[model samples]
Target: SNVPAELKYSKEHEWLRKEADGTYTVGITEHAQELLGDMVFVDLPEVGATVSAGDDCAVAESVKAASDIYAPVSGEIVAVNDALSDSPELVNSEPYAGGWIFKIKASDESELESLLDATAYEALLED
Candidate 1:
C-alpha cells in the first residue's frame, strides 16, 4: 500500500490533507478502503454542520461491512463530495483523490499536530 508522505493520519484510519486555503480535505486512507472492501454507500455530514474531533460524522458501507467515519479535527463541514452518492466505487478506486469525503474549516489548526505522519501511520499498520 502507498501511504503518501504529505498527509497526516488519524488513529481511526482517516487521512487529512491541509489545503492551500487553510481548510482541510478528509478521506478514508487506502488501508481503510481495503479493509472495508468495495463501497456501496457513503453517508456524509451536511455542509455547515459543526463537528468535534473524534465525532462520528459519516459512514461508509461496503460489501464487507459498514464503518463509521470520524472527524480528525474540530471544525465546520464546508463541503462534501456528493459524487459518492452515485459512484461509491470511487472510494475503492481512488481513495486519495477523487474519493475524498469532505472538506472542513478547522477551528484550531494546532490540533493537527496530534495526528500521525506517514511514517508513524505506516508503523501503526504494521502493529
Candidate 2:
C-alpha cells in the first residue's frame, strides 16, 4: 500500500490533504488508481458546487469501468484539475500530485479528524 504518511483517507480510498488556508485537497488514493487501471475521462463537479459529506462529487472513467469519487466532507467545490479533462491519465501516473480531483471549502473540520491515518489506511487495504 502506497499510503502517504501525511494524508487522511476514507474507507472508499479517497485521500485528503489539509491546506494552510483551512480548506482541503481531495483525490482518489493510489490504490484507487491502480484498481481502475488506466483513466480515460474525468467528470468534475462544477466549481462552486455544494456537496454533502459522502456525496458522489466526481467520476473517473477508465476503459475497464467508471467509478464514482465521493466527498469526504460536506463543502462547496472551489477548484478542479482542468487538466484532467484532456489527460485523465494523470490520475494513474500521479494520484497524489497533479492528479488531484478537486479542492473543498469543507463545512466540517471534525470530519477530517475522523478519516484514517496512513497506518490505519494500510491496515484497511490488508483486509
Candidate 3:
C-alpha cells in the first residue's frame, strides 16, 4: 500500500523506477512481497542480457511460492542486485530500496505508457 507515486507499476506487480541516466531500477512491489510472504531465494537475469516486455526474466521465490518477474519493457539488463543472492530477505525488509532486484536500459520508453500509473494502480488494489 506504500507504492510510490513516482514509480510505474506492472500488472504482474513489479515496480519500475526510471533513473536519471535512462536506466530503470526494478523490483517487486510491497503488495507483492506481502502476498508472497518472506523471500527465500531469487534468480536474477544476467547483466547485458536483452529482455522483452512481458518476458519472464527473473524469479522471486517466497516461503510459499515462486513467481516469475516479468520485464516491464524490452531492454538490456544493465545490472543486477548481486547481494540478493545471499540475502533475499531484502525483498521483505526493503522491497522498495535495498531490496531492488535489477536494472535495465529501456529499449522503448513508449512501452511505459502501457503500465499502470499510481492512481490507477491504487484503485486496482482496492478491496
Tens-digit lDDT track for model 3 on 47-103? 999999988998889877888888888999999999898999999899989899999
Model 1 lDDT per residue over 17-115, tens place = 999999999998999888999999999999999999989999999887889999999999999999999999998898989899999998986887888
Candidate 2 regions off by >4 Å?
Answer: none
lDDT of 2 by residue, 18-73 (tens): 89998889989989898999999999999999999989889999997888988888
On lDDT, the stronger of 1 and 3 is 1
> Would you list the C-alpha lDDT of every candidate in the order shown?
0.92, 0.90, 0.89
The TM-score of candidate 3 is 0.93
Worst 10 residues of 2 by lDDT: 106-115
Error of 2 at 8 (Å): 0.7
- The runs of at least 3 residues in candidate 3 whose Cα sits more than 4 Å from the true structure, single-residue gaps closed, are none
TM-score of each: 0.95, 0.95, 0.93
Q: Judged by lDDT against the true structure, how good is candidate 2?
A: 0.90
